[PDB]
Design a protein around this ligand. Structure first.
Ligand SMILES: [Zn+2]
Ligand SMILES: [Zn+2]
Ligand SMILES: [Zn+2]
Ligand SMILES: [Zn+2]
Ligand SMILES: [Zn+2]
Ligand SMILES: [Zn+2]
Ligand SMILES: [Zn+2]
Ligand SMILES: [Zn+2]
Ligand SMILES: [Zn+2]
Ligand SMILES: [Zn+2]
Ligand SMILES: [Zn+2]
Ligand SMILES: [Zn+2]
Lengths: 162, 162, 162
RNA sequence: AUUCAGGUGAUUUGCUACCUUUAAGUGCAGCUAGAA
RNA sequence: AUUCAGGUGAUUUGCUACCUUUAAGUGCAGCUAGAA
RNA sequence: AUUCAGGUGAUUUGCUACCUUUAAGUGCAGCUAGAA
């Protein structure tokens, strides 16, 4: 899996249909909001999930939860690295999605953390995909609330360019 | 698996054929003798094994032994909890066997220990069933002595009601 | 697996076809050169690999390498015990191969080390056989150089007695 | 005797794990404490 | 209540693993630093 | 940004494991040392 950004246009568009769709731009955002790379591929839908830095309430989110996949350094649990917000993953269009230029990022604390994250994500691909799959099923079945509207998003998203 | 008692009649009856069959009633017995719940099911035989509180010689009984399955609190080895005496498991008749009313036992040290035991037994079902299976095979094969007479008990036990 | 020696004749013979074939006798050799016992059995070929005591360059040989299987005491990694030189394993003829008389070796530092080695080898039989298998395939495929000439050795070796 | 097989990580120092049936990057150290 | 089943290690003290679906000696200690 | 999905244990607080393909209760804490 990999790190992506998403065009602001395309994020506004999904926001017409679901305010739950993650904010793309914010004055207080140092770097751009980043997404994780095809957490879920099903019925020809490619999903990307939002990354998000630590909040207070992440302490209550237990590992079993389908809402989030908690990140942290490999083998170093006390090094919390934020989480993947699956509850807000969205379907994407290859053309409005862009991979982070990791090969060109200046060596900074951030790019550094991205690699810590990346590796933990790489070694947990499956748990992630597995979680995303189930989250959607449930969401769709009407057994889970307060997530992104998968059903509706999946319906409207490709009508972006019109 | 679960906790059972066995009618005294039926225990006397098997004792006609094998004195090795565990004692059901004793003046020094606080609670009734308790048995563990289908350690072995084979050729339509349901086996229950006797529970037994610590004796001195349980220290010499090594884990590999087929005679006994040593109990102790989950993850707390120094908390020895007696053992399951497979060498004396017997085949039973659903109608002379009775489940302990755990849902109605007053909160006492005993009921408390039963749950410690139960869980350790639950998480080791397989080893237990596995041990019981092998113990019988061997016993039947004539490669093990000083156990209950499985072959003979299996033959005679259903003729209980006559 | 076990410890063997190989007749000097048969070792000279293979040396007619491949100088890479391990030296059998040397003035500086305390004990005879020893071989490990059927590292590989395939298309009716029985392979024995040479043992060899620590050299400087064994530090660069990584575990993944097909060239050698590094020995050392069980659970005691700092106790390097030389390595098995698979890159030089050779096919053998039961009649020119001989098992070391371990049962009759006087208790010496050497015989002592042999058992340390033996056990580590016994507990890794598979990795060894697995490595040998792959090493040959590759060697045969022409993807590996500087080893014994398996293809050529396999062809010529049985013509020993002529 | 025969003096480091080639690969798997958007990164990879040490070891280890895995792939070479054409496929494969885990784990324990170290380093880091980044922020959406 | 009923006082430790045998075995698998060219060697193996304790425990463990494992085998007794015809099979099975792993791991931790302990001892060992040996040489091709 | 967006502030804990429900389950699997004759019992189970905290975490965790597992299940969510109709399935699934593990492990570490803590509590506890009961007796056949
Ligand atoms: Zn939950
Ligand atoms: Zn974790
Ligand atoms: Zn008698
Ligand atoms: Zn035994
Ligand atoms: Zn235990
Ligand atoms: Zn290499
Ligand atoms: Zn090693
Ligand atoms: Zn034994
Ligand atoms: Zn021993
Ligand atoms: Zn949130
Ligand atoms: Zn739950
Ligand atoms: Zn709870």
């Amino acid at each position: 899996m990999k790190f992506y950004t998403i065009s602001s246009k395309y994020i506004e568009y999904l926001k017409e249909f679901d305010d739950k769709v993650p904010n793309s731009e914010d004055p207080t955002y140092q770097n751009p909001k980043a997404f994780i790379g095809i957490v879920l591929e099903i019925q020809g839908h490619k999903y990307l999930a939002p990354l998000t830095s630590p909040k207070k309430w992440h302490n209550n989110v237990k590992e079993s939860s389908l809402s989030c996949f908690k990140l942290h350094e490999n083998g170093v649990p006390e090094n919390q690295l934020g989480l993947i917000n699956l509850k807000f993953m969205i379907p994407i269009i290859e053309a409005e999605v862009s991979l982070l230029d990791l090969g060109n990022m200046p060596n900074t604390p951030y790019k550094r953390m991205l690699y810590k994250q990346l590796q933990f994500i790489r070694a947990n691909s499956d748990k992630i995909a597995s979680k995303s799959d189930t989250l959607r099923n449930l969401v769709l079945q009407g057994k889970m609330q307060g997530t992104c509207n998968f059903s509706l998003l999946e319906e409207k998203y490709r009508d972006f360019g019109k």
